Design a protein around this ligand. Sequence first.
Ligand SMILES: Nc1ncnc2c1ncn2[C@@H]1O[C@H](COP(=O)(O)OP(=O)(O)OP(=O)(O)O)[C@@H](O)[C@H]1O
Length: 332
Amino acid sequence: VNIKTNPFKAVSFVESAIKKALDNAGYLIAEIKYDGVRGNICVDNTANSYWLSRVSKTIPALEHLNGFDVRWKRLLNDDRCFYKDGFMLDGELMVKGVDFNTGSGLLRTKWTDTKNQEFHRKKDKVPFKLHTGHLHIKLYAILPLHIVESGEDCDVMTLLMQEHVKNMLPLLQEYFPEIEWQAAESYEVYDMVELQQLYEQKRAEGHEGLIVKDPMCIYKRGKKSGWWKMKPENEADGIIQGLVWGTKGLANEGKVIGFEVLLESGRLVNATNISRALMDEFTETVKEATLSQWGFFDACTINPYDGWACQISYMEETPDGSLRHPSFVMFR
Ligand SMILES: Nc1ncnc2c1ncn2[C@@H]1O[C@H](COP(=O)(O)OP(=O)(O)OP(=O)(O)O)[C@@H](O)[C@H]1O
């Protein structure tokens, strides 16, 4: 319909599905699931761009990057550009300096609060323009525009799309050096233990997930199977009543990675996969409370959280009630 960009939206973690992609492909693409605003930058053969969203609506802080710019004409003419018909870039639009969800608020703002262009005071009525020098973007796909307009799936499997994006990247950086153009970080994992290892390595850096991509899946339209969110999206309850610590026999952590959480049903779940920042914050609390013994692991560790009711998140649920890949969300 009238530029219904309608991008590929990953479906939620389904381990059986991912296991079948793995078997059939020989590995899995896994990228960080960035938290920003998804941009679908349409550039036509008229040398016009549209900084659209996942919902085919223009993005306020970036509405000022739309319309005609000669450098798109020159980029399309370039040998190295394969989309002479025009193209759509798919990726995450991040702001530099701020945290996620300040960046995102910044992008949806129209009326100031200054991270502005003008320049490189304000009291009201001012169309805010996000300064390009604040925009960091992370591309994961690019489509020939006529396929975006038709609604059809773009028949480029995942492993090829990355070639198409690493090839577009220097034309973009050359002609438009205002913006920080980059490719999403992708890792190729050969087994399910490698997938879990990577996932929690990234939870530990405060990224709350990955998008697992079937390397042989093509670029599909709308929410469809093939791209999977590996992120705890089922939230849940319980009381904390224990501390799970950190594997001193073979691993990264020497102090508290989560809680023993008694679930409503009678299940004891060890809700861990947390940020590193929450790990080191929880250990100080454990370390201090126990230092009214002075020792710190007639005497045992005070957990200054036993009995604390909480909300745990998990990825999915096995027949026998097992919660697959559970993490802590917040006490409640
Ligand atoms: N590296 C990535 N590869 C693909 N999609 C990604 C990637 N990183 C972030 N995303 C995003 O995650 C999406 C799909 O996840 P999801 O359906 O949960 O939406 P959400 O934006 O994360 O949250 P919500 O829909 O509830 O508002 C995309 O629309 C996109 O913006």
